[PDB]
Design a protein around this motif. Structure first.
Motif, short mmCIF file in Angstrom:
data_model
loop_
_atom_site.label_atom_id
_atom_site.label_comp_id
_atom_site.label_asym_id
_atom_site.label_seq_id
_atom_site.Cartn_x
_atom_site.Cartn_y
_atom_site.Cartn_z
N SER A 29 0.85 -1.14 -0.20
CA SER A 29 0.03 -0.07 0.06
C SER A 29 0.91 1.44 0.02
N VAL A 30 0.41 2.31 -0.59
CA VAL A 30 1.11 3.52 -0.43
C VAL A 30 -0.06 4.79 -0.16
N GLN A 31 0.36 5.70 0.67
CA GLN A 31 -0.58 6.93 1.03
C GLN A 31 0.14 7.89 1.02
N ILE A 32 -0.23 9.21 0.18
CA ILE A 32 0.39 10.40 0.10
C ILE A 32 -0.71 11.29 0.44
N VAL A 33 -0.40 12.03 1.45
CA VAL A 33 -1.05 13.40 1.95
C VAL A 33 -0.33 14.74 1.61
N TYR A 34 -0.67 15.41 0.89
CA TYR A 34 -0.16 16.52 0.43
C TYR A 34 -0.92 17.82 0.90
N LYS A 35 -0.58 18.43 2.12
CA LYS A 35 -1.60 19.78 2.57
C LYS A 35 -0.72 20.68 3.04
N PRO A 36 0.30 21.31 2.27
CA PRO A 36 0.83 22.56 2.63
C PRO A 36 -0.26 23.71 2.95
N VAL A 37 0.08 24.55 4.10
CA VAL A 37 -0.90 25.49 4.50
C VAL A 37 -0.28 26.89 4.39
N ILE A 73 -3.97 9.02 -3.14
CA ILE A 73 -3.30 10.39 -2.99
C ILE A 73 -4.33 11.29 -2.52
N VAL A 74 -3.88 12.25 -1.65
CA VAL A 74 -4.79 13.10 -1.23
C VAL A 74 -4.12 14.60 -1.54
N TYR A 75 -4.58 15.41 -2.33
CA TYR A 75 -3.91 16.65 -2.72
C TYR A 75 -4.66 17.77 -2.38
N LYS A 76 -4.51 18.43 -1.18
CA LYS A 76 -5.47 19.57 -0.67
C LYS A 76 -4.60 20.68 -0.12
N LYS A 109 2.95 18.58 4.89
CA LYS A 109 2.36 19.45 5.60
C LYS A 109 3.33 20.72 6.11
N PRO A 110 3.91 21.58 5.20
CA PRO A 110 4.60 22.73 5.88
C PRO A 110 3.42 23.65 5.96
N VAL A 111 3.54 24.41 7.22
CA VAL A 111 2.83 25.48 7.47
C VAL A 111 3.45 26.87 7.28
N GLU A 166 8.30 30.64 -4.12
CA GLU A 166 8.12 29.58 -3.02
C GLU A 166 7.85 28.49 -4.01
N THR A 167 8.61 27.20 -3.74
CA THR A 167 8.40 26.01 -4.58
C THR A 167 8.40 24.69 -3.63
N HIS A 168 7.43 23.94 -3.79
CA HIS A 168 7.48 22.57 -3.33
C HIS A 168 7.29 21.30 -4.21
#
Lengths: 75, 75, 75, 75, 75, 75
Positions: free
Chosen positions: A1-9, B4-7, C7-9, C68-70
């Motif tokens: 399994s692979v899970q990616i969460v990409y949530k920059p704020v 993939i969660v891209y939020k 999750k960079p903030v 800014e880059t991700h």
């Protein structure tokens, strides 16, 4: 399994306050201006300003520029 | 399995306050301006300004420019 | 198994306050200005200013620039 | 197995702006006040004010009150 | 096994701006006040104020009060 | 096995700006105050003020109060 969460704020602020701000000018007083000209000659562009009191704010600057990139890439 | 969660979240602010802002001018006073000209000659473009009091705000700047890119890519 | 949390903030401020701010000018007083000109000759651009009191704020600067880059990448 | 994560985030604002704010008063002008008092009697407290122009700002209010409680409890 | 993570975050603001703020008064003018008192009698406390121009700002209020409680409890 | 990670964060701000702030008074003028008193009698305490111009700021309030209780408790 692979899970990616990409949530920059981003909650950041960018601000410019450019020019003349909050100043008080009390009775600023231009004196008398006399210009007297005789028999002059000009062979290219003349740009001329004459005046008792000039108050000037010129702002070519103060621009804000935000560039932001996101690039999640997989296999 | 792959998830993939891209939020990405953007709550950021950009602001410019460019020019003349919040200033107080109390009884600003231009003096007498006298311009006298005789027998002058000119062979290209003349730009002339004459006046007792000039208050000027010129703002070519203060522009905001936000450029944003997202590029989720898979296999 | 793989789990990636990205999750960079950002809570940052960027701020510029450029020019003339919060000043008090009390009875600033231009003197008498006399210009007398005779038999001058010009072979070039003439740029001329004459005046008793000039108060000038010029702001080409004070711009903010955030880049800014991700780039999350997998296999 | 048990995992508990307790991460409430508070970014809230509370603000009060109570009283007189940002007003302009230009030449407000109290009139002549004449008081003539003769042969009076008083058998209890006298509280007395006499005056031509009164500007009064009174703020018993405008208080802020934040009450916050967190109570994670286990078995 | 048991894991508890307790990481509440507070970034909140509380603010009061109570009283007289940022106001401009230009030439506010109290008039003449004349008080003439004769043959009076008083049998309890006298509190008396007389004056041409009064500016008063009174702030019993504007207090900030933060109460915060955390009570992680286990078995 | 048991693990507890109690790590609350406070970054909050509390602030009061009570009283008179940032105001401008230009040539405020009290007028003439005349008080004439004859054949009076007083049988308890007198508190008296007389004057042409007053500017009073009084702040019994504006206090900041914080209470912050942490009570990690185990078996």
């Amino acid at each position: 399994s692979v899970q990616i969460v990409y949530k920059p704020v981003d909650l950041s602020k960018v601000t410019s306050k450019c020019g003349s701000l909050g100043n008080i000018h009390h009775k600023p007083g231009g004196g008398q201006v006399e210009v007297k000209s005789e028999k002059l000659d000009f062979k290219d562009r003349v740009q001329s300003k004459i005046g008792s009191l000039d108050n000037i704010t010129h702002v070519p600057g103060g621009g804000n520029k935000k560039i932001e990139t996101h690039k999640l890439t997989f296999r």
